[PDB]
């Protein structure tokens, strides 16, 4: 659903869904082709 969110200081508005991206253990944020954030690691569950 479209919610506001704040993930460890990164804030914004959007719909959060299950990702099929595989982040390596040191990665916290992901970005798309245009250098805007498009995925996060949950600070508590570590799900992408």
């Amino acid at each position: 659903k479209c919610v506001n969110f704040n993930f460890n200081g990164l804030t914004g508005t959007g719909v959060l869904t299950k990702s099929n991206k595989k982040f390596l253990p040191f990665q916290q944020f992901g970005r798309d082709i245009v250098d805007t954030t498009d995925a996060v690691r949950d600070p508590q569950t570590l799900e992408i």
């Binding site: 869904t17 990702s19 099929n20 991206k21 798309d32 082709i33 245009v34 805007t36 498009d38």
Partner: protein, 45 residues
């Protein structure tokens, strides 16, 4: 022979993907493309 990259349609359901941006704003940054009034079939006619 000609590949048209924009080819505007209803792409919000299309946009959701693993690599969401897939692109030329993907609509999200405020840039969209309107369809032509005459479709390719109408021009062919």
């Amino acid at each position: 022979k000609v590949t048209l990259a924009d080819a505007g349609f209803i792409k919000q359901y299309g946009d959701c993907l693993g690599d969401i941006a897939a692109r030329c704003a993907q609509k999200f940054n405020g840039l969209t493309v309107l369809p032509p009034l005459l479709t390719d079939e109408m021009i062919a006619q």
